[PDB]
Amino acid sequence: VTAITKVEREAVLVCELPSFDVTDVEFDLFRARESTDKPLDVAAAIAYRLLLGSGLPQKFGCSDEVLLNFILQCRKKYRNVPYHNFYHVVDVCQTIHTFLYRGNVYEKLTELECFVLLITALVHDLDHMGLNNSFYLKTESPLGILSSASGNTSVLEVHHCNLAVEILSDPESDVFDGLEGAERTLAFRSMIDCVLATDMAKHGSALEAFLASAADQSSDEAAFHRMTMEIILKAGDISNVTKPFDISRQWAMAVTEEFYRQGDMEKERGVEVLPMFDRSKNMELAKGQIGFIDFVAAPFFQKIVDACLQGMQWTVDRIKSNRAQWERVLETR
């Protein structure tokens, strides 16, 4: 990777965010973006203030300047896509911080596990092109061909991991350079394992393994820590429906557009498209969000909360409240 310059660092350091609190469950990233000329500098400043405010990089030997360089090297590898961009990953990092520290999930994990989680949120979708794993496999795109020949169908998640390793190989952006021996190894393994767990083809497997390990904890403490890390990255990743309605709605507009674009691209390529990805078969946003809530997100959050993450109850309450709002949109169309 090329060196981060003094000017690039300075353009982040000048951002003031008076009147925002980045640790709060009601924090609004859209309003932070809209408040400035330079929304990419503001988003970088949010991630910087959040990580330093935690105390964790200081604990684990990561200097202020290595932390910032890492944040800016992540930023340069995100694309100009509608949803899977630098704003998504800064949102995921902020949200995980709320789960650790307002939902008290930090009680279930070591400090080192918490540091790894927050860093991993920023690398978890590096160089995403707005196309899912099925696109690559069905169209025989070159990365699809490499996946099948190679024997791993998590085409996207392996790519994100390759680029995380690339960034951390430069001493100027290695946030894990203060760790020793076995700890350094734990960090790399954890990071990678968590990123691989974000592929929605493993959603059901991940959730079963978590609920099994939570039913003991005692019998295998290490497997419970590992699964808790995976399940919290996954929860941050699909957290848009746990936010204030107007924030939730903006996220939904953006993801929906990436679905449509994939569908246009498959059609172009002679592949027959599922109707959720088809501009021609949909009108309003409401029914899609109600479906995502009923069939994926509401059961996921209620199960993790009931099994041991009791301090995360507000997520369920806000999901139910957003869903009633979409329901009203439908029945008074």
Ligand SMILES: COc1ccc(C2=NN(C3CCCCCC3)C(=O)[C@@H]3CC=CC[C@H]23)cc1C#CC(N)=O
């Ligand atoms: C805020 O809304 C949303 C937020 C996220 C997703 C995601 N779905 N899936 C898949 C989609 C195919 C069906 C099988 C289950 C879920 C992904 O693999 C995406 C990539 C990684 C994680 C979740 C992502 C969908 C919606 C929606 C909607 C809507 N139709 O309104």
Ligand SMILES: [Mg+2]
């Ligand atoms: Mg992903």
Ligand SMILES: [Zn+2]
């Ligand atoms: Zn993601």
